[PDB]
């Protein structure tokens, strides 16, 4: 019912490019889903192959994804790509 | 794995939609040339797949696995400064 | 970008075989029930999607 | 991925308004012909794709 | 711009969709609660815009603008050696 | 009907990328088609934007894509790109 969300540190330029882009407040209302609950069906939430994996991602718009994959023991989500256009 | 030919398939054809979508199981279409021969998938399941060919076509599954590996540590969510960006 | 039903799948179904292989785009099937929508794939592009997510 | 028809699109025509804004996915609509078959985006999506096309 | 609101592109929502298709301009929704603001786009200018962003997103297009600018000079491609390769 | 075919010398390294991943019959494909009519409606072709500068694009499988403009008055086809991805 409630998660703890990290960002691994060498993903954090990408946030850069999110507040640059204006996109700060998709990707935030993203945070407050996986907050809550990362497995919630919208935000056009997909479980990536391979599956076994377990990586997740949620859509900031058309262009740009949070990727990120779930501790369920501890209940934290880390976010390891909020750019998906090669930089 | 289920192969079938162009016609047994086109013979079936509603029931191998249902099938795909309900077993989550492909079905390969396999017959005398090169330009009948295909796979349908359950949409679900293919946006699934399309999802991640984006991401790897984009490089970002690539930036994923190193971040995975890396040696950086996680910052909590809540303590990013969007000014000190 | 073909979008087509079940129905006029199965009736043009030759020529969405050639389709998806000399375009290399998927044909889309959606039909009333929407649950049971699927995509058809050229098996080449599919063994090279299907690589690409699972290469060692 | 989200497909409905030219008549579905008009009843649920509020409701997907905001499932494209919330789910930032096109809605597809696919008719009988080609005069129908069009997509539904959200503005501020559309925006940003606007401005990817058009860069300095 | 056309632009219409959510009541009036619902009644006539037949001729929209044949519009932007005829005319291959986008018709913009604009409502009280701008968060349900959209675009209604033909389906083939629709999948130039998809083709044109999945390049722009792969870093294609560019690499294709630094191309047209680079001074490389061309080479007929039956002349390519594919052995050498 | 013949139209001449030209890459730019700095594409030549997408042409290596294409045939070591198999894909050298299908751009040769393309390339056949750029000879007859580059306008052709084949091979997923595309009118890229923005329209104006009249840069086309056509499918050599799900991935990449043949990436090209048109010299019209001299029936030139300019390849630009035949690898989309950043390696």
């Given at each position: 019912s409630n998660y703890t969300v990290k960002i691994?540190?060498?993903?954090?330029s990408d946030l850069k490019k999110i507040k640059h882009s204006y996109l700060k407040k998709s990707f935030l209302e993203i945070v407050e889903?996986?907050?809550?609950?990362?497995?919630?069906?919208t935000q056009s939430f997909e479980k990536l192959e391979p599956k076994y994996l377990e990586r997740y991602?949620?859509?900031?718009?058309?262009?740009?994804?949070?990727?990120?994959?779930?501790?369920?023991?501890?209940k934290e989500?880390?976010?390891?790509?909020?750019?998906?256009?090669?930089? | 794995?289920?192969?079938?030919?162009?016609?047994?398939?086109?013979?079936?054809?509603?029931?191998?939609?249902?099938?795909?979508?309900?077993?989550?199981?492909?079905?390969?279409?396999?017959?005398?040339?090169a330009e009948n021969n295909a796979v349908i998938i359950g949409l679900?399941?293919?946006?699934?797949?399309?999802?991640?060919?984006?991401?790897?076509?984009?490089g970002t599954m690539d930036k994923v696995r190193e971040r995975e590996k890396d040696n950086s540590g996680t910052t909590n969510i809540d303590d990013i400064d969007w000014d000190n960006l």
């Open positions: 691994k540190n060498s993903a954090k889903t996986l907050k809550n609950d990362p497995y919630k069906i991602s949620r859509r900031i718009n058309h262009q740009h994804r949070v990727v990120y994959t779930v501790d369920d023991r501890n989500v880390l976010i390891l790509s909020a750019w998906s256009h090669y930089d | 794995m289920i192969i079938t030919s162009p016609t047994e398939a086109r013979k079936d054809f509603y029931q191998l939609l249902k099938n795909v979508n309900n077993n989550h199981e492909p079905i390969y279409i396999s017959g005398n040339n679900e399941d293919w946006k699934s797949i399309q999802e991640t060919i984006y991401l790897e076509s984009t």
